[PDB]
């Protein structure tokens, strides 16, 4: 928990580029406060010198001065507000952009334990609270502070004897504001966590909607959301209770100043040194000082909430991202990947998921990983992509350990068809050519799609390649969204290709056409196809059988089949 001025010194490097746009705002605020103070001091001359027997010596030129002062105040307030809001908007943009670009680079080990709801709350709630507090509440806070300091200097100018009490009452209000702002920040952080839970529940509902319908998850989801929204309301209630018990207390404490000055001025031995105008302007200033104080202490809730959000985001932005310890970069790999004594236990587990693998993938060939449905088959594919780091043992690419290569230059050498195919809500062309859209002409996209037996059914759609695919490609069947992932992978010429259950959903002749396409196209590029259909693999250069997490049998189709090993029992039952 950082104090509300510690957060600004933690934020200053972000604001520093725009400090030129803040000097004008500060000068405008100073002039605004001066104009308001001089306008309130204008009550002095129309009771002392203004009133006389048929006397309008100042009143003849008075209201025009009020209009001019009002115009000055208006333009200064406008420029101050707009420039402060511009700086706030730029800073909020920078924080939001950096936050998004940060969680976009965290390791997958982090994504496997955090619900989507909390991160979406980070993007769309905390940043929004910071923006709202620093655009709407900050201007009010700083302007009322300027007005208050102006009233202070004015009351000390006219009569110090009637304003020594403010020296004794400033510390009390400072302590009260500090001790209530701490509570505001704590409640705001708990409130942020509760919003995270709310959006997590909402996203679990939305993403798993069909199962909610089919299994009758009506009442349970409704009750869970009821409880979480109730917690949200209760924490908001605690914040409101703090605010509404801190406003009147401070207002009453600030009213001892007015009570004292009335008590002090009640002494005829003191009022002699002053006139009616000075006394009435002191009383008016003390009376009208309470309004800025009340407004500041009331708006202090939103400003403190924004400061809490900024503190949380700065803590998040200071986390550790994926280990990009790599130094060397490479353009195209020759196509050979080697394992050595590699073992790898998943984050937060006891038994290793691989005990020791000595797999060797030759350059420009294919290696297939058949085996049971619970062994390490997708784990190997994740490892050769550096999704997870090894525990011990060496994994090599082109004779140099896989940790020397930087992350970008490595994954730019591998194309993957995940068993859980995920497609973006965009046209078919942009799903096939996801990141390198500008580098691949529609001719290349069409060739890649025709390779993956997808152009046959794309033509049937409304706009051909231009059709929108839906939120997750739900507009297409599983065997039409597992042939766009294949097309996307085949579009690139990455020498290392992984087919993590490429044809799980396809029928037999469609996958036969796929296999023909790869056999006529992948004659030079290394592939790592993993599948339980032992007909997409009978042409592999070396079949590898992994069960329980350890390699058991390595060899060609013929050498394994006549060996009467585990592959023989796997093949004899198709």
Ligand X SMILES: CCCCCCCC/C=C\CCCCCCCC(=O)O[C@@H](COC(=O)CCCCCCCCCCCCCCC)COP(=O)([O-])OCC[N+](C)(C)C
- If one counts every other C-beta atom within 10 angstroms of the C-beta of residue 548, the result is 14
x/- map, 523-542, ligand VO4, by CB under 6 A: ---------x----------
181 binds ligand X (CB under 6 A): yes
Name which position in 138, 154, 281, 296 contacts ligand X (CB under 6 A): 296
Check if the beta carbon of residue 428 is closer than 8 Å to that of residue 469: yes
CA dist 7 → 3, 12, 146, 232, 312 (Å): 6, 9, 21, 25, 10
Q: Between 313 and 476, whose beta carbon lies closer to ligand ADP?
A: 476
Ranges of H-type helices in 353-414: 378-383, 407-411
Q: Which three-class secondary structure state does DSSP give residue 244?
A: helix
Q: Residue 319 burial by CB count (10 A; 0-12/13-18/19+): exposed, middle or buried?
A: exposed
Q: Which residues 408-427 are close enough to bind Mg ion by CB under 5 A?
A: 419
113 binds a second copy (CB under 8 A): yes
Q: Between 115 and 378, whose beta carbon lies closer to Mg ion?
A: 378
**Cα-based torsion angle of the residue sequence 55, 60, 65, 68 in order, rounded to the nearest 10 degrees:** 160
552 binds ligand VO4 (CB under 6 A): no
Structure tokens at 430: 């942009």
Q: Is 378 annotated as a binding residue?
A: yes
Check if the beta carbon of residue 427 is closer than 8 Å to that of residue 466: yes
374 binds Mg ion (CB under 5 A): no
Q: Which residues 449-508 are close enough to bind ligand VO4 by CB under 6 A?
A: 477-480, 501, 505-506
Q: Between 239 and 531, whose beta carbon lies closer to ligand VO4?
A: 531
Nearest alpha-carbon partner for 88 in 303, 308, 296, 301: 303
Q: Is 306 annotated as a binding residue?
A: no
| Cα–Cα distance, 19 to 90 (Å, whole number) | 11
Q: Strand 526-530 and strand 337-344: pairing? A: unpaired
x/- map, 175-204, ligand VO4, by CB under 6 A: ------------------------------
Check if the beta carbon of residue 389 is closer than 8 Å to that of residue 383: no
Residue 532: contacted member of ligand VO4, ligand ADP, ligand X, none (CB under 5 to 8 Å, by partner type): ligand VO4
208 binds Mg ion (CB under 5 A): no
Check if the beta carbon of residue 192 is closer than 8 Å to that of residue 121: yes
Q: Between 43 and 396, whose beta carbon lies closer to a second copy?
A: 43
135 binds ligand X (CB under 6 A): no
Beta bridge partners, 328, equal 405
Q: How far is the CB of 444 from ligand VO4 (least distance, A)?
A: 26
| Cα–Cα distance, 385 to 327 (Å, whole number) | 17
Structure tokens at 237: 């209630």
Cα-based angle 115, 117, 121 (whole degrees, multiple of 5): 130
Q: Is 374 annotated as a binding residue?
A: yes
| Cα–Cα distance, 383 to 6 (Å, whole number) | 43
Name which position in 19, 23, 68, 112 contacts ligand ADP (CB under 6 A): 112
Q: Between 259 and 474, whose beta carbon lies closer to ligand ADP?
A: 474
| Cα–Cα distance, 541 to 544 (Å, whole number) | 10
x/- map, 139-178, ligand ADP, by CB under 6 A: ----------------------------------------
Q: Is 150 annotated as a binding residue?
A: no
Residue 512: contacted member of a second copy, ligand VO4, Mg ion, none (CB under 5 to 8 Å, by partner type): a second copy
Q: Between 197 and 243, whose beta carbon lies closer to ligand X?
A: 243
298 binds Mg ion (CB under 5 A): no
258 binds a second copy (CB under 8 A): yes
Instruction: Please list, residue by residue across 328-339, b when 16 or more beta carbons sit within 10 angstroms of its beta carbon and e when fewer do.
Output: eebeebebbbbb
Indicate the residue whose CB is closest to ligand VO4: 479
Residue 178: contacted member of ligand VO4, Mg ion, ligand X, none (CB under 5 to 8 Å, by partner type): ligand X
Q: Which stretch binds ligand X (CB under 6 A): 140-148, 337-345, 432-440, 442-450?
A: 140-148
Beta bridge partners, 360, equal 338
495 binds ligand ADP (CB under 6 A): no
Q: What is the DSSP string of 82-122?
A: HHHHHHHHHHHHHHHHHHHHHHTSS-HHHHTTS-HHHHHHI
Q: How far is the CB of 317 from ligand VO4 (least distance, A)?
A: 36
SS3 content of the chain, % helix, strand, coil (to 5): 60, 10, 30
Q: Between 181 and 375, whose beta carbon lies closer to ligand X?
A: 181
477 binds Mg ion (CB under 5 A): yes
Residues engaged in binding Mg ion (CB under 5 A): 378, 419, 477-478
Residues placed in the known binding site for ATP: 371-378
Residues engaged in binding ligand VO4 (CB under 6 A): 373-374, 377-378, 419, 477-480, 501, 505-506, 532
Residues engaged in binding ligand ADP (CB under 6 A): 112, 346, 349, 353, 373-379, 457, 474-480
Residues placed in the known binding site: 371-378
Residues engaged in binding ligand X (CB under 6 A): 4, 141-142, 145-146, 148-149, 169-170, 173-174, 177-178, 181, 254, 293, 296, 300
């Amino acid at each position: 928990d950082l104090s509300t001025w510690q957060t600004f010194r933690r934020l200053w490097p972000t604001i520093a580029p725009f400090k030129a746009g803040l000097i004008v705002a500060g000068v405008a605020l100073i002039l605004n406060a001066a104009s308001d103070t001089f306008m309130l001091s204008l009550l002095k001359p129309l009771l002392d010198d203004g009133f006389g027997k048929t006397d309008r010596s100042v009143l003849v030129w008075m209201p025009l001065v009020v209009i001019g002062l009002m115009i000055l105040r208006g333009i200064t307030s406008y420029v101050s507000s707009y420039c402060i809001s511009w700086v706030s908007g730029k800073v909020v943009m920078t924080m939001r952009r950096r936050l998004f670009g940060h969680m976009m680079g965290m390791p997958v080990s982090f994504f496997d334990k955090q619900s989507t709801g909390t991160l979406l709350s980070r993007i769309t709630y905390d940043s929004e609270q910071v923006a709202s507090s620093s655009s709407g509440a900050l201007i009010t806070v700083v302007r009322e502070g300027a007005s208050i300091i102006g009233l202070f200097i004015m009351m000390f100018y006219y009569s110090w004897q009637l304003s020594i009490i403010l020296i004794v009452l400033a510390p009390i209000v400072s302590i009260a504001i500090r001790v209530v702002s701490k509570r505001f920040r704590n409640i705001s952080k708990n409130m942020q966590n509760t919003m995270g839970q709310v959006t997590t529940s909402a996203e679990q509902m939305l993403k798993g909607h069909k199962e909610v319908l089919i299994f009758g998850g009506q009442e349970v989801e409704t009750k869970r959301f009821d409880k979480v929204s109730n917690r949200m309301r209760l924490q908001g209630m605690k914040m409101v209770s703090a605010s509404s018990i801190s406003d009147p207390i401070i207002q009453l404490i600030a009213s001892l100043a007015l009570a004292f000055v009335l008590y002090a001025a009640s002494f005829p031995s003191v009022m002699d040194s002053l006139t009616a105008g000075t006394i009435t302007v002191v009383f008016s200033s003390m009376i009208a000082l309470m309004r800025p104080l009340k407004s500041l202490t009331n708006v202090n809730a939103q400003f403190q909430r924004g400061m809490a959000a900024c503190q949380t985001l700065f803590t998040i932005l200071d986390s550790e991202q994926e280990k990009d310890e790599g130094k060397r970069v490479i353009e195209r790999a020759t196509g050979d990947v080697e394992f050595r004594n590699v073992t790898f236990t998943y984050p937060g587990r006891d038994v290793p998921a691989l005990r020791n693998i000595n797999l060797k993938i030759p350059a420009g060939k294919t290696v297939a990983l058949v085996g049971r449905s619970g062994s390490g088959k997708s784990t190997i594919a994740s490892l050769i992509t550096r999704f997870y780091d090894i525990d011990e043992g060496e994994i090599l690419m082109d004779g140099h350990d896989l940790r020397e290569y930087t992350l970008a230059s490595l994954r730019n050498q591998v194309a993957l068809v995940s068993q859980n195919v995920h497609l973006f809500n965009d046209t078919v062309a942009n799903n096939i050519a996801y990141a390198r859209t500008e580098q691949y002409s529609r001719e290349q996209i069409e060739e890649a799609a025709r390779m993956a037996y997808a152009m046959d059914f794309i033509n049937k759609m409304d706009n051909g390649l231009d059709t929108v695919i839906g939120e997750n490609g739900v507009l297409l069947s599983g065997g039409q969204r597992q042939r766009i992932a294949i097309a996307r992978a085949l579009l690139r010429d990455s020498p290392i290709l992984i087919l993590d259950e490429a044809t799980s959903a396809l029928d037999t002749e469609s996958e036969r056409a796929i296999q023909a396409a790869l056999d006529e196209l992948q004659k030079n590029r290394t592939s790592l196809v993993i599948a339980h259909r032992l007909s997409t693999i009978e042409k592999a250069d070396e079949i590898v059988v992994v069960e329980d997490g350890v390699i058991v049998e390595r060899g060609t189709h013929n050498d394994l089949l006549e060996h009467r090993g585990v592959y023989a029992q796997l093949h004899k039952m198709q």
